[model samples]
Target chain A: SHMLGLIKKKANTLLGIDISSTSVKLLELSRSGGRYKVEAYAVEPLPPNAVVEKNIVELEGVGQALSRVLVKAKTNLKSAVVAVAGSAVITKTIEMEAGLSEDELENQLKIEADQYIPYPLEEVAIDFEVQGLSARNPERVDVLLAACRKENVEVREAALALAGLTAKVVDVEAYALERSYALLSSQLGADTDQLTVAVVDIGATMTTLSVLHNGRTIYTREQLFGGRQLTEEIQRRYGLSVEEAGLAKKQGGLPDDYDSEVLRPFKDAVVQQVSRSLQFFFAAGQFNDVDYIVLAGGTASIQDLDRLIQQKIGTPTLVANPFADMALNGKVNAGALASDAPALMIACGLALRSFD
Target chain B: SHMLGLIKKKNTLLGIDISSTSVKLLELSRSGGRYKVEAYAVEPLPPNAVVEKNIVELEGVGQALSRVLVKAKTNLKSAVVAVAGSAVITKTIEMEAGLSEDELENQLKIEADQYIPYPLEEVAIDFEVQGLSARNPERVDVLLAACRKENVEVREAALALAGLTAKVVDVEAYALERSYALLSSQLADTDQLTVAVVDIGATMTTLSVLHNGRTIYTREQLFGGRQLTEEIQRRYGLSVEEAGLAKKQGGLPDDYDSEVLRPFKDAVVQQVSRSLQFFFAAGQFNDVDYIVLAGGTASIQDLDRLIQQKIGTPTLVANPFADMALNGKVNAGALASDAPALMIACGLALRSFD
Candidate 1:
């Protein structure tokens, strides 16, 4: 296994895989002319509770889904890029005097590791980079320290291994979304300069809000409300199994009252979740107004959700479509891919890492 | 000689705050968690001595500090002062992950021009390297701050007039944040509480929003008590000095209370309301847990009540020394009346035990 970070890209193909609580999102891309082309992608659902709270509860269940998704995409790529939940990572920014060798800086961090990282250093996978000069003193430099339990990385690597895929790069989930947000700048149009954008990713069980200022992730928070609740509601209201309800929610064969009684309230709940998350951000006093809100994840595809959120939250809102500017290969289905684009943000972000 | 946030609890020091109107000095000694106000004084400066917080008559400002030191009568020599927020610039960027200190500096030397607006030769620059970049794991984010050298030197020179050593020069808003620790106890469950400190200085009304004792946002507006003075000047037909003196001394025309006083206080209430609304519009918080009123204008009677009633947040006038034991040399009544004005100085004084 490679160290937690900084492995150069290999010639072999690498797929960006995002394993959410309910599905595996795999994306493959090739870049040209300052843009990307999606060669292939797949969204494969896992067993119920196969992954709970971003933790893989059943490795075999997750691995089987990954295996199916790889075949579904019809790609021979054996190397993969994935990310851990942002909550799984511990990050800190500290200042050091300029002019020390990398090894010297590493030695210093290790010596004083206890002060920054409460857990023992041996139990964690750590990496750092000099962010830039210090705000307090230009004579010193700002070094960003990132660490997470080695267990988080190990579990992800093992899960990928089960599908015969090598985990080439395991990143923090929000950072990968931050990477995908580069593709989203055009979606924002003139709002990108110093605009505070809140990207709300509503997966099956988790709704993560990533707030960016000047194209950088400044705050991230995750909650327990997602599309799974609506699917369950459909199951409860329509007297059907989970799959039937999931299918009905997407295929549109449900009764007219389904939109009024079930889906409308769920969308309202999602709006509440987004509003609640940002309430905490404002409480910190870092910022007050959200200039734009970009909705992502599978649930974001619900009709008029972008308009509803804009009307309710009073911020301009839109569903994310990272593939809007990209070229689609002959094998890719533009309609289904566009529908899945919001949910694929994390996966696509990892795939975009290749171009970086 | 020192960087910003040079928080070292080396020895007892005085917090000296220099504004356009006056030079304020404060010395605080802590025992356990409670504070003791050892010495405190306020000496008025000559007109335009420090206009808009820029040192116009540096020598006269020094003379005021000299008078304030004598009045304060504190044996402490090391002093902490701050520059106005407008005088500073802050930036954040990413650098290579595996670079040496020399290489990082080399990289910065070549690229810093793109970040800073001032010529590098004339500015006092400082930096702190923070954490890793999420988009690129091979890089880190660095926060940098810069200010013209004279913004620091003028205060150091003024401190010299009072025979005090300038130990640390801090940003004014940060000083307000540091000083907030003393006033924060007034609120309960501060860990979850969101509070805004409204400091109405002579020319600037600054609102600093703090959560868990850390400042998250700050805003400075050009409106202040000076507007009221100008209003008094136009309505009552007085010069700036006469109007300022009359506003403080009272005993003007009987209509003054209804005409000038009430209208000015209403404007303050409006200002606080607008500032808090701007913070609320940011979308994270709908309401603040508390609002703290500070600075000279905050001493206006019933202003706190007006803000509380209007803004709907529990409001109080910030008296950082309210819980402190005052030494015999310091007059308790005068200090209490002037305590709201000494928030920055007290915050700087608290830095001594950092």
Candidate 2:
């Protein structure tokens, strides 16, 4: 976690563990004949206030939830891969000599990494990947360097350690999402090249919009808008406790007008948020048109959310289900896995490290 | 030196030599505008404790090092040491010109196995950019150096056991070259000089050629003072211990010089001459401007004049401490006795200022 080895290779059957503010999710995938099969999957809710906006404040609470998900998934793998939020990582690409040996290059990078990273070297964990030869100068190759605070990596590692699992790869969440997007894009048509796709993930309290052009991510942003706002609205309107409102939202025990009077309005608010996020994306870059919009995360499971987004935003909107084309094992509940598919993008991406 | 600022800086450093036969300790201090020998000590090791200049018996080496430290008594906590040149592997390759230092480093590390013979985990690798490549100005020449991590780790462990920290682990040949800096100042203009250093050690002979004060070539051959010791043991019908004692005490029969030592001295001259001839044949230059003889064998009586007469190149015995003052605590006589064999140790000690 002290930036000792970021892009090293460790061959193992690895599981993916994703911890968010609301819950912990785990996924394991096995590929055969170029087709991935979901070997196991599990989602377990975290205790209220256990996590406050994605940073682990109570490690024991998070670890207990992680343990629960692992047991629920019934996977035998002892090692897992995880990721830090994109906001916690800083990334840069630079050209370097192609002739240096690996050990020499590592020493050289350590000497100069301080110039690009703002924090003291002791406070950060760093890793890099060589992205092939550079176009400007064929003699040199392009390398991507990523770094995050040691605490961000250590906390996740400690949590996994507490659950009797090892953290094999502590990747950035954006990269994990990007890894899963390759699978997600395969479900779309073959002409996705030159097309701008916006993957909007709505979780419990945070919403992230990641814009991808072709296959690479061009921009991403996070906003404080998610299902938690609707839960609070239900608690205030029904004079119920937070837990009861959460249960009722999922179980549907409210009055008939709950759809017309409250739920529809919340859906409209989500549409507005997605529209505002796209405007921000356009303001920051040259592109003003998005060819496709993909909805992800738990909140994207709401009824007709994609239709409403497409009707209002004037773009092809679809719910992200990365596992749609992949087969599931006998132990998994197909319906529950399908319903929770959107929120498992990062977990699925982390699981992809096993194949890599 | 490319990782120049990585280690904590210290003003003083003890140069420790864990060689084939013994451990040598040296310390240098700079005051006002001149250098001084603050401490000096040498301790012999148990037979087979060091094999081929590697510490085979860690505890034995550590104990010997501890004794040397106590004898020197400089209270210096940090040290600089070196591994044998034969144990180090070096390669020079061309790299793209425009890489930021970090990118170049990353790329090289990712592809290290292609050039290194050993697994990446077992070697300690380091590199320096040697300016631009001659073939393509857009590319730069990088020098890569690596050694078995065990070699570096054992020295560090031995020093740590003696209550000293190893601040730098350098290569023996490079340290010898660095020590040549002191000798260069005593000669004529060094700006365009080609000097050859012929170091005769206990069991090895190495020749290093320097062009304009920079090392360009180095070669090692299995020849050294140990052969003379073994011959003395056989000729005098004495045990290894008695032969070594008699060689140092020099109470042998007068015919020992005329019959025994003289033949060995003549053999040394022949070896040096042949070594230079091989160098001349392999390189472009037919002659070197100066030849500096160093190592314990170089102390043989009139060995310099013998080599000069045989090879016909102006020859001189290396005395790195000739211009330096000695502290009161250090025995000047003992320092002079050991000075000729301490070129590498002295070079390691020079790293203190850097």
Candidate 3:
């Protein structure tokens, strides 16, 4: 297994590009004097079927879309970081003797790692981070191992290369989401270490719940329910094309009872989906309840949905704003950026990689 | 990961399935290719005896297994049991067709680290040749199997407690496929057929596709059957025990069928449809030639009829015992209704013959 440099820091500038089924989000940040400021950011709808189900299917279409995003962002950085879907990566936690050097640990894993991954060692890219000393064994450390097929990383590299951007890191969405805690921790006040949080990211075609306890992600699940359901639902409810429906969802101009008939029900459905996702988490023999819920992705833009989740689930809920305190450039529309901040979680996480 | 008994016959042995809910046992005797069930019994496992197939209480499981033995009145001391397929890793690799199967097993033991993701010393490993590979005729399709020896030991320890020797530890899906030998005679064009075998248990639903008399694909999901039972309990305001009892006895409210039952049936058909969709996306054939419904939930009156009409694929309630004659001491009446539920047990018992 090849290490993809997960959790290993390199202090170099790279754009964070989060490509979903619907859009390509590009975000770059420059930190000066210990304060972060957004240098350039742009988001553009991807070409139809460019990246289907988080898989880079049409390399040319996605590459062209990336080029267009670069054109809009006006960022000169050609080195970028991207993420693979959570489903394609297999992560496991194992205990190893704490005295071993990281080098010795790597060599030991090479001799003994075959049993943890189902794929051949040659085909997988692997990385590990020592979480801490094992709870029961003081002499051992709990190491979080993440591995994905090389093809998953290679496709992203190939697609980025087509756009003349070097793929500096191919990371998992869960790990990318985990890195957001540094920025998010300030927003969430005291007891951050004691709190268990479920960050539900409702994107175009998927809703992912990544649960973090003590500043680390312990479980991640992806369900196939997202804005596409609402988009396709709107298409049939109104006489609108697929693109028109998606646009109307973001910027509305529809008849009365639209909220009553479509959006309200869709919101309830989102509540139901999150409820079901939480039930799965609860059933997983865990701590049984989350202390807080952070809503992410573009769907979190809807008003009162955060309040609705709190009322329904009885957990303190907030729409994720990872870019809350960051300064924006003159060309950036702060209002539009604020509306789409939750969706840029992965992008922001990848951008933070440019720092130590 | 243990042996599936690709060796000489051991006269007779019972197939025992220590399921989450029950300890099901069956002993079969074969006359050439045909078969006869010498014994069959299913005894309830005490609550929490086995939680989600993990065998939480070993003594409780052994007690249930011993009860099954008493009810079946079998003198057989040798037994074969299965671990859930989810707990086992089965991979098909190509090996030179000319090598001895035993030597192949030994070679794979040294090479298990190449694929298995655990310390080679910690897991049990086995392999069986699936004849020649279609890709290259010079190589054979060798199916390798592995699972933590800890999982295997727990099941073996339970069997040993019941005075039974662990003849072979098997994988559930492979055992179910092994029992396909009995049911293929019931199907038309057994030589050239693709069948979707949908087994709906209380909580777990599985779809195993059989193509050309071999299982080509299998998947499992935790879904309905329990949903309906819980739905009934909540709707009718009955306790879980009463609801399950009433569900079998059929003294429910008049609106039960239309309100709860039909919706469940339709959802199951939808589940079946989505299952087929996934199998197709596995990049295999577009459709199965036939569909066979199994498991206890398959007895849900006319489910096959509805599934056939809705899925447009001819479906039948699986009856693997259809070809087996009675051995004069046992009754076919109980087995007639439970044949599908007992399919795994029957498949495990097949190790006795080979």
Candidate 4:
């Protein structure tokens, strides 16, 4: 019912819910004195084609998956934080006089927003933030405005409602990454400033490159590259069910040549994609090199990926683990959390919003 | 409800400019490689209504803009307007070298947030291919330009309130540079030399440098004719309106020219010289062969001569309509004086030719 997914509300306890193309991820973290304890986390695979490229095509199926996540995690929290893909959001910064009241500025912006927004006013939900004064003109302030289609936000909310949960905060995935980066940067012992870090999230169906400079996100690019290709290849080569192939991918039941024939080639292709994405960022920006490349999302958990990427790209690479320094509740499986660490970046970011 | 509302058509459109001080509307019709001023009008806005170049009062802007449209009396239904440079962010992104422009545009729209700071629904995004990527020929360089939807939407709303459509939303700096083609032929033996086009506004002075007829650099600083108007108001005990009118009419005391106008002219020349020096210091260029003075301040008597004497660069007032025919309804004398300020509008109107 609420406008599409750019909302934030403080809650006592919160869960992070990520509904990707293939599954639903839920995580809950509780913190004390800068130390985080992962209270609950779960990943529930969805029905085939339940979601397509991050959009819920089968609401019932996705709801079922969300239901499973809640049951598996045993999270008592009813409010959750979620994210819409960065590609789905649009943003711009404009300079306006500092004299107008917030309400007045909002009214004026709404009246003048028709030309800037391509969609009809009724179909989009918009928000803005004052990004301080304009350096060029001190009398004016710069405002960053953002808008997303109402449908994108509503569908997620409807699905959450189906799973008996309320959407506490619906954030943009890029911003989620930005928030979660503070945790990762500390783990990496990174000087958040004067460092160009690339957060490459290779999920089931999308590979995104989010380049951060001195802790600020400056560039992001998404490509249709992900782990699903390997799943499809395994399914065809072994003539197994998609589910069976996915299981084999994690448990390793395929033939010996599988490593050389399929997995190796896929890994090589991923390397090429990583290199290509970096090149795009390099060409698009003034910087020629990034000091670090942090990999996240499901595909990033593959063995030796960090090493292979570092070897090829010549950049220090690591798999993201925001919970590395966090305490784990007894019910949580430490090994599983470590293995699923990379994929949980966005979820963790969302869960961390409980404090903010 | 097309996605972030990009509509492209081939129809020739009018160019409308809403600056900090006033609104200017211009229409051009091309005939045999030359442009004819079809319809144009300038109207002042109520003060504080459009402060710092962004529309603060939509209703006041709409009314003033409507008046300009009515005064022009052009039958054209579509127009082009420009956003300020401070309001726009541009970057070059590398996309698949093999993708078609339409396909690339679609992808960029979907992925625009990575580069744009505003929300997808709050920004208008458009891109053009710069060329093959410098590092890798397989990829293409896409110059992405984005501005807050409000900057565009406000202008559109104003036009819509006046019963017109916005066909193109352009950037002011680029649009002003685009009008250079209209003046290219007027400059003699200047294609081989760097040229600086300077515009003096109410509170901003901008210098745009062109290398070999292409705009390579642009810089803006706080300086304009408003300071002079304020001075006249302060010294002569006149109201703001009276002082502005008197400055334009020039029937003041003889002492006023020597005491006030001459000093203002010297300040304008000094501002021009300082802007040129700043441009030279910031970029690779050391000097410009010619200085093209534009905007209302450029209309001041002997200002260009003073600039030429101080900067030692051949200076001329910009009159983009020097050779263009004017519609019978348009006044020639008024247009000639307003030509410099209309440069950006002319460049936008010339998009009709494309």
Candidate 5:
């Protein structure tokens, strides 16, 4: 009921729907010069198994939730941008014959995606790009292949369909964040320096850190924890309900005893998460000494949090703000939105689809 | 020469050192179900300057360097100890009543020479303590205070101050490394699921998370706030003199307050913020949950969440020996208060005095 009153719904809008672990959020943005303003947005919580681990275990429940999200947002954007959980997708680049036709390549991928993907051919949805000619092997084209489960892709489509929304483009979440990152950091201009940076999205339930090189999502991994865990801990330790705990956590007026009783546990958890995330990234040998760390999420607003992160990880880190350099719109509330800026990333990315 | 002589010394001894910043470590855990610890430990690196935010910018860096081995290894009995990063070397003990003021003062000052290593002539000593008799209403713990010359504490003590052959006092960072030298994986006989040794010395702060008796992550924050102090001084036209005096006055307390004090809190917050901003700008992550504060400045209350709120995590100042051995003779109760800094010293002492 509260979401319905706040979110607007409309037709012909490009809905950016983020189907996260805990909830599904739908957003639509309209372009106005260099910036996109929010046209409509709605968020609705989902049951645990609705889309657990990127598998559509309870499609109908998710479908109904999506339906409610649209009803609340009050938009008629039938076509929407959806994504596969980072784990459900596989991205790789390989050299192949340069002369193959688009259809021929699709045919080739249908037969070949199985080699690299452990899932059965029928279970996966495959797409690829012929990245011109490979510099190392001029005769061959460097083909970038991406694969996800048909079920994962289909369920998102089905959920949106049930919500009266259509899935027009199915992209990986990492690339979506990259598209948003490029739009935000365009001042860097072409990134000729090839600076390896990590974009960390501290979502509600899971935290995803993606390392980017030359404007590409070269490496990424997701941790199974985020702000919600802290919220839960506060709620449990303080004997407050979830909502009350969230409010108290954001606006700290607790007893001195609260620090050792609750806050330290949360900080240690964050340290452990970061250490593990960096270790995994290092193990993959893709990005080390990440030149910059951009922290985006609802929780980045915690004061002095960035300093604590730096001390814990011994690396440079920053909070994520899409409008860091952009001119403000009349709708912009810099003070209120500054801390919550990381929360709007998906909506901003979906709205950036204006160019498309 | 000191290091070489110590190396050739008999090997059964172990040393345990402590510092203001981190618990330095140097453990040699011999194999087999039965474990023999050789080189013990020291506190992490905390040079007076590094401890004071001017890292490696102190006069006695070489002396701090020598402190590394003397305190860390547990194998050598001929050991050495160093002054605290922030302590001014004041000893306190409860004494009996009925003694004249001059008599009490003379007795305590002379006796202080034992706990204190400096010569009674060149040192300044003082004392205070609670009443020993029931009739005496006041209870003041006698404190034997000593302020040796900067050079004496910095360089001379390690060499007994006579021959000028003192070993390099290992700064905070190396002291911490010496302290955490080895882990007895099987001897984890405690209720602590995970142990963290956080050292918050005068100027430097460090966090080390240990699970199953092994360090998992170690992080260090750069020197900060001094810049803000300079910024305030530059803006307000007060020297570090009046500015510092006004800041410590607490609450709105006169010309010092209006001209300097109010601005100091703002400057401190700004410095902390900018430091974090710089750190974040340099790294990447989702944000950590558990953060342990270990530094001199960490005592600035409410700084934890300014960090936690921004990072959306949890944070706490750490006490390294909240659960460790505290021999009563060692003033263990007082040690707990500044235990955050002695991590390295404890480690070094654990390592070499075997």
Candidate 6:
């Protein structure tokens, strides 16, 4: 139930940062051949209006906050991945002829995209990744096209630029977690090749449910509800300052009765989110149920969390570990780290693109 | 300010409903020279799996539920308004030319003929009384069109088969509270005319923010996270499916729906922010200073207090009848029972009918 330390390489590594309305979370993971490890991780608080309404108004303020996280955690790498979420950003999964290379599809989408997308194509930055060679069409592939206004990307770019850091792979959060899920599922050893699963990444500001079968996100829904509400509830109920409330809640320093009083409310919130998001997916005409429900994020650390979720959803639920079977070093407490394991999912997900 | 209970004429009223997932809310409105009470109402919870995505699904439900609402409320009001949400279906266009006060008007009068898709007369078309000119002012004018496709219009007509008559059609969320702010602002005390309406129906939700009484921001998102009662239903040995339906109809054991809906209430708070966050994303109002929550689910007892804490704004749950005169003979208390419930339909019934 306790994580002593993390497993990480004795070498250099980078961290993945999540910029949300309430706080900033940074994750770092290291992989040696097939072995994965968590190097360093830390989270820092951002001031109100530092990021609100999904726009970063206080660039330097956020950068200074992020920079402090790096200094306190002693993170070294300057390269990282960050994402932007809001309704303005649109994500699409385009099924195309499988044989074409990533370049060919990119060029094709640039033309065919003008029809499917209503926004001025030139004003948006577009990116795509190959799901795999589709068995339905051995010659076809599934590509997810994610597009957002130039300014949306520029905000994060500016924040990182302010911190004297580089923002690499401007990917979507759901996709980053999808990448994390793919890597995590492959290591779970269930021969996931046949099973489909929904990876529910419940972060502080947003809860994203991504349905992946054979490692591709076929259905995804982003709901604005998140752990921040739980923290706010703690603040209101306990009369604690927002910052102190968040810390006490995370560090198990809340009143001893907090588990039944607070965690239960939060667990019920997780279930509500999971069920509603799944309804949206089903409304989109996706009848295929996921074989498993994988819970990720700081709040997923609660014991018997998966059991609570499974009892409500009737789906096999499990905690996510990006480095489940990977080897670790003594510099970190392996068992203790696994207890709070889901934290490294995004970092592990982004680390999959290492040296690319 | 507290509300003084008022009485009104008694009659079975039908509630007209339109939402993201389901459609059809009918409430009978009795107007004894501008006094009304919601006599009875019926709603069919269309699960999306059951109806058209938006347009037809809304129409068919309006027709079917109008009949069912009549049967449920057992009230007789042949007239009902089938309304539209932002997501329902709409097209706005700007056309220009020059002639004379009468000639230019006649020119636009004829030109608008081709612009609307429905056979010109089959659809009810009206122009917004404001916003007639843009920067290139003198030569061009703006003509706003509110058009409902023939079938979209006719489905409401079919509601007549259910003993309900179709009167005028209006945009669901915008008309109710938005028009009220504009019409009431001049007489009522307020520094500004700007207002916002958060209509929380059974399945879908709408938030319309008006500046000077015209819609400046309008949005509709999927509704009913309060259905979290379905989880409690399963947990407490209650029928999960029926729990979701029982929420709107009321009459559940005390503490049953609310207890099951606790987390869902938190999720709703989150959902509301998430919804407004989208409006913010679409390049509209940066922040809405005042908001009014209306519709069926708005009746969820402490929702207004909870929403205010999450959204951090001055909020009020709407009762569209706040200003309307009520005759003592009506069961005004019963109508006020679903005061938030009939906001949209009542707003439409009170509007300038075509």
Task: Give one digit per residue, the lDDT tens place, for model 1 in B69-107.
Answer: 888887888887888767778788888798877787777
Cα lDDT tens digits for candidate 4, B1-354: 111111111147888888888989899874223357889898888888888778888888888878998899988888777777778787878888888767887898899999988988887776767678889999988777777777777777777887877776766765675576557556742335578999888777888887765677777877888988889988989877898888778877778988898998888877777777787888678888888988888888888888888778898888878757778999998899888888888877765544
lDDT of 5 by residue, A1-356 (tens): 11010001112346788787667777676532123355566668787667665566787898888988888777757778776656766777777777889878878777766778767887877767776799998988888776766777677777778877877766566545765676555433324125667777887777888887766667878877888887888777778886688778878877798778777777677767777877788888844577777777777776666778888888877777665544443443456555566776765565454333
Q: Where in model 4 is the C-alpha error above 4 Å? A: A1-11, A95-108, A131-142, B1-354
User: A88-156 in candidate 4: lDDT tens per residue?
Assistant: 777777778798887778777776666687657878766676777899999999877777787887888
Q: iRMS for all predictions?
A: 21.6, 22.2, 27.8, 23.2, 31.8, 33.2
Q: What is the lDDT of candidate 5?
A: 0.54
Model 2 lDDT at residue A221: 87
Sort candidate 6 into its docking category: incorrect
| Cα lDDT computed for each candidate against the true fold | 0.78, 0.79, 0.78, 0.79, 0.54, 0.60
The residue-by-residue lDDT of candidate 6 on A3-61, one tens digit each, is 00011012334457877776676667664222345667666779888988568889988
Residue runs of model 3 more than 4 Å from their true location after superposition: A1-356, B1-10, B91-110, B128-143
Q: Provide a comma-separated list of chain B TM-scores, one per candidate.
A: 0.88, 0.89, 0.86, 0.90, 0.39, 0.67
DockQ of each: 0.01, 0.01, 0.01, 0.01, 0.00, 0.00
Weakest 10 consecutive residues, lDDT, candidate 2 chain A?
A: A1-10
- Model 1 gets an lDDT of 0.78
lDDT of model 2, residue A289: 87
Model 1, which residues run further than 4 Å from truth?
A: A1-356, B1-10, B96-110, B131-140, B231-249
The predicted structure with the larger lDDT, 4 or 6, is 4
Span of ten consecutive residues with least summed lDDT in model 6 chain B: B1-10
What is the C-alpha lDDT profile of model 2 across A1-356, one tens digit per residue?
11111111123568988889889999998743134679999988988788898688989999999889988999988888787777777777877889877677767877667788766777867676677789999999887776667788788889998889888777667767766877775566643444679999998899999998876789988899999898998999989887898888878899988898889999999999999999999999899888889999988999899999999999899998888668788998899898889999989988875654
DockQ of 5: 0.00
TM-score of chain B of 3: 0.86
- For candidate 3, the docking band is incorrect
